[PDB]
Design a binder for this molecule. Structure first.
Ligand code: K
Ligand code: MG
Ligand code: MG
Ligand code: MG
Ligand code: MG
Ligand code: MG
Ligand code: MG
Ligand code: MG
Ligand code: MG
Ligand code: MG
Ligand code: MG
Ligand code: MG
Ligand code: MG
Ligand code: MG
Ligand code: MG
Ligand code: MG
Ligand code: MG
Ligand code: MG
Ligand code: MG
Ligand code: MG
Ligand code: MG
Ligand code: MG
Ligand code: MG
Ligand code: MG
Ligand code: MG
Ligand code: MG
Ligand code: MG
Ligand code: MG
Ligand code: MG
Ligand code: MG
Ligand code: MG
Ligand code: MG
Ligand code: MG
Ligand code: MG
Ligand code: MG
Ligand code: MG
Ligand code: MG
Ligand code: MG
Ligand code: MG
Ligand code: MG
Ligand code: MG
Ligand code: MG
Ligand code: MG
Ligand code: MG
Ligand code: MG
Ligand code: MG
Ligand code: MG
Ligand code: MG
Ligand code: MG
Ligand code: MG
Ligand code: MG
Ligand code: MG
Ligand code: MG
Ligand code: ZN
Lengths: 69, 23, 83, 123, 181
RNA sequence: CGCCUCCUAAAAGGUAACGGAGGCGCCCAAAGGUCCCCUCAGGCGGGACGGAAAUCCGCCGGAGAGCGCAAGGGUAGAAGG
RNA sequence: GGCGACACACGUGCUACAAUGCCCACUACAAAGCGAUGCCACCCGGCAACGGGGAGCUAAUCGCAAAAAGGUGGGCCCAGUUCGGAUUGGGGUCUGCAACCCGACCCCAUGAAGCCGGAAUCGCUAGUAAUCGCGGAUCAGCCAUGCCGCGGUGAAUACG
RNA sequence: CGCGGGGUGGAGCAGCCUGGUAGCUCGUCGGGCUCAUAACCCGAAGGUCGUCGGUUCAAAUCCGGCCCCCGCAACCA
């Protein structure tokens, strides 16, 4: 590697919002992040967030069957 | 403003009551 | 929307028309003027002729258009833009 | 890029900052804070890193926000356009949807005026 | 060389799963990562500035490797482009610097993409290489919104020795590439 | 009306007509010397903005690119970068 | 079903573009009107629209009722914003046989144009203009920001 | 197939020479003033430059063919 043209990679500690820690190398000695891969709702298996719906619209528009049988 | 229904001023305008103008 | 303290509105006369078809192995062409009658699960798969003020438009009813009124699918004004 | 995917602006109180998130008006800003014990007057600049994640966790988990909210708004318009209901034709041709007359204004929904020529008099 | 979690994972976890997944008779048959090439095709900096600097300085922070300029091969009137204008930055990441960047790209960068729903499975080379595109450079942890001045994206070329897409997709998913479908 | 290239020109050279078509009256301080290194066009597949065409990656590709400007000759085992 | 259409054009108005402002809480001072399948005190459910109870009043007695600007306290700090409230998604409420075309209101979210307006143009001479709110007729409900009234605060200027 | 000039918003003219930028007057359309019209005042739209082909990174602009339209010439034998 050429001398004097690159930033020195150093051991680096990465901190996520889920209390996660990553031991990688970087140009910054310690970086904090709000999200990592250990907690991204896509990554964390199915993790269906606010929306378990699908949908239930619309044929689940019951309530009610109160027309006389 | 008076057009902002979600305010104690706009509710006075439409003459109505709600969380944003209770009685 | 209609106060759900009251029911979901179907003019009854239209509702008979569809429950007979289900019982007798549907379906006939159903021509009604009740543009207001709410699409109700007992209608999916049928086709209702909705009067828009001039004609009875056919309307094939699917599951994804249930919470609606029939008039929503037979528009009353023809446009085509201005010259 | 802090919460949710938007950086809520520092130097402002935390309750108004959270409104800069698509999906959070003033009343939802009132909730999240109270349900997490953060003084609604605290400036964003002056929040703990412990308070960041406590505010963030609830906000991002209670209600759906930025992109997903837009995708679910888009899905319902799309649904109305697909079935062909009267509201669906409105969203297509780009005309208003909630009973407003169009002979005059509707400009928010129609856009800039497209001035045409008119009928003429007789000299 | 040195210890990066992704590298040690490639040998410990991903190589034996590949062999038992595909039946490689030779130890050099099993797919390898070869290089990671990052391309910022700017063109905004054609003449409007030498903003290439503030964008190579940020590429240098993300990869640990100083980028090199790319110049316009031909002249193009519609592009307002004279032959030889500096219109991009490219950097070839190999060996450990390749692992460190790939490790952070999976662990922090791709999740930081908003509305992220996984990498496109269709974007494989046809011959076992992969390419993706990013629209923001602040997706990476070394870049902060205070240190930025204008949003610039990039093309990422990951080259492997796999002869097929089928082998390469197994190589990249096993390493931890979240594919949408 | 002088000069260059192709054809006419009859497989050496030369060869005419108010025969068929073009070009020149400059340019370059590197576009010159040498040493070291590099190899195009285009096709297809892949890639944020990005398009037919900017830059990036893979595969194919003997030269159809390039060589300041006409044409012809020559040329990547370089004259091209 | 249409009178509510919509490439367009004009009139009359509402709301504003902000700090002499906006917002929340506390706290004062009107007038003229209306009110027996009427007005609804107070009570509980509800974030709210409202709902259920439920007194009083054929009304100088009971109710609509809170008047608002204002006064006090505090928050915003010049941003397309704690200005503005259009547009749109979802969820409800209510009147009505029935709210698709085509109702009003409430709540979550969305938060457009607009930075004081070209040529041109309107009203007002005093408790007037300006600004603040309140009531009635029509009326099941209501597209009323319209009209007919009512008081609150309260100017500038007229040489000619 | 004697020699010239010209073709570009609806009309009449710049821009071509010197390749990168389409412009001027009227006309046309929306508003204003007027009882009304004109004049006048405030705004706006409309031209891929006869055509095909070439050069060039790029053509209304440079080069060659075709179409169209005016002008000149046609003497002595
Ligand atoms: K003679
Ligand atoms: Mg039934
Ligand atoms: Mg407000
Ligand atoms: Mg918001
Ligand atoms: Mg209408
Ligand atoms: Mg083996
Ligand atoms: Mg290294
Ligand atoms: Mg494929
Ligand atoms: Mg970052
Ligand atoms: Mg490969
Ligand atoms: Mg001579
Ligand atoms: Mg000479
Ligand atoms: Mg010869
Ligand atoms: Mg010869
Ligand atoms: Mg000789
Ligand atoms: Mg001779
Ligand atoms: Mg010549
Ligand atoms: Mg020299
Ligand atoms: Mg030379
Ligand atoms: Mg040299
Ligand atoms: Mg491609
Ligand atoms: Mg491209
Ligand atoms: Mg060339
Ligand atoms: Mg030449
Ligand atoms: Mg050649
Ligand atoms: Mg107008
Ligand atoms: Mg009005
Ligand atoms: Mg007006
Ligand atoms: Mg009242
Ligand atoms: Mg805004
Ligand atoms: Mg603006
Ligand atoms: Mg605001
Ligand atoms: Mg709605
Ligand atoms: Mg209605
Ligand atoms: Mg301002
Ligand atoms: Mg003014
Ligand atoms: Mg007088
Ligand atoms: Mg006011
Ligand atoms: Mg009424
Ligand atoms: Mg309306
Ligand atoms: Mg009133
Ligand atoms: Mg013409
Ligand atoms: Mg003309
Ligand atoms: Mg000229
Ligand atoms: Mg010029
Ligand atoms: Mg012009
Ligand atoms: Mg006119
Ligand atoms: Mg008269
Ligand atoms: Mg006139
Ligand atoms: Mg103009
Ligand atoms: Mg020509
Ligand atoms: Mg041009
Ligand atoms: Mg003579
Ligand atoms: Zn995490």
């Amino acid at each position: 590697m050429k001398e004097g043209i690159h930033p020195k990679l150093v051991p680096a500690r990465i901190i996520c919002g889920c209390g996660n820690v990553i031991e990688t190398y970087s140009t910054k000695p310690e970086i904090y992040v709000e999200v990592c891969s250990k907690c991204h709702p896509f990554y964390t298996g199915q993790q269906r967030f606010v929306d378990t719906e699908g949908r239930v619209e619309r044929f689940q528009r019951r309530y009610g069957d109160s027309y006389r049988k | 403003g008076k057009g902002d229904r979600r305010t104690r001023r706009g509710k006075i305008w439409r003459g109505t009551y709600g969380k944003y103008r209770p009685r | 929307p209609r106060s759900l303290k009251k029911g979901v509105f179907v003019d009854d006369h239209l509702l008979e028309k569809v429950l007979e078809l289900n019982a007798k192995g549907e379906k006939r062409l159903i021509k009604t003027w009740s543009r207001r009658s709410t699409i109700v699960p007992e209608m999916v798969g049928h086709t209702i002729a909705v009067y828009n003020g001039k004609q009875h438009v056919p309307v094939y009813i699917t599951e994804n258009m249930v919470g609606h009124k029939l008039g929503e699918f037979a528009p009353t004004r023809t446009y085509r833009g201005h010259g | 890029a802090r919460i949710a995917g938007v950086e809520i602006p520092r130097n402002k109180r935390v309750d108004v900052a959270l409104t800069y998130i698509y999906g959070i008006g003033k009343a939802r800003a009132k909730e999240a804070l109270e349900k997490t014990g953060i003084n609604p007057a605290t400036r964003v600049k002056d929040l703990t890193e412990a308070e960041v994640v406590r505010l963030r966790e609830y906000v991002e988990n209670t209600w759906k926000l930025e992109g997903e909210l837009r995708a679910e708004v888009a899905a319902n318009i799309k649904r109305l356009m697909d079935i062909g209901c009267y509201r669906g034709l409105r969203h297509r041709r780009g005309l208003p949807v909630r009973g407003q007359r169009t002979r005059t204004n509707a400009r928010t929904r129609k856009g800039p005026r497209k001035t045409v020529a008119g009928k003429k008099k007789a000299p | 060389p040195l210890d990066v979690a992704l590298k040690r994972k490639y040998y410990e976890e991903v190589r034996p799963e590949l062999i038992r997944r595909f039946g490689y008779q030779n130890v050099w048959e099993v797919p390898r990562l070869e290089k990671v090439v990052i391309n910022q095709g700017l063109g905004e900096a054609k003449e409007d500035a030498r903003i290439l600097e503030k964008a190579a300085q940020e590429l240098a922070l993300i990869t640990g490797q100083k980028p090199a300029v790319t110049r316009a091969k031909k002249s193009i009137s519609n592009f307002k482009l004279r032959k030889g204008m500096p219109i991009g930055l490219r950097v070839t990441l190999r060996r450990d610097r390749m692992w460190i960047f790939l490790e952070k790209l999976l662990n922090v960068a791709l999740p930081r993409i908003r509305d992220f729903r996984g990498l496109n499975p269709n974007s494989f080379d046809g011959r076992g290489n992969y390419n993706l595109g990013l629209r923001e450079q602040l997706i990476f942890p070394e870049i902060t919104y205070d240190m930025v001045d204008a949003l610039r994206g990039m093309d990422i070329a990951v080259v492997t020795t796999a002869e097929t897409d089928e082998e390469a997709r197994a190589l990249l998913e096993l390493l931890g590439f979240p594919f949408r479908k």
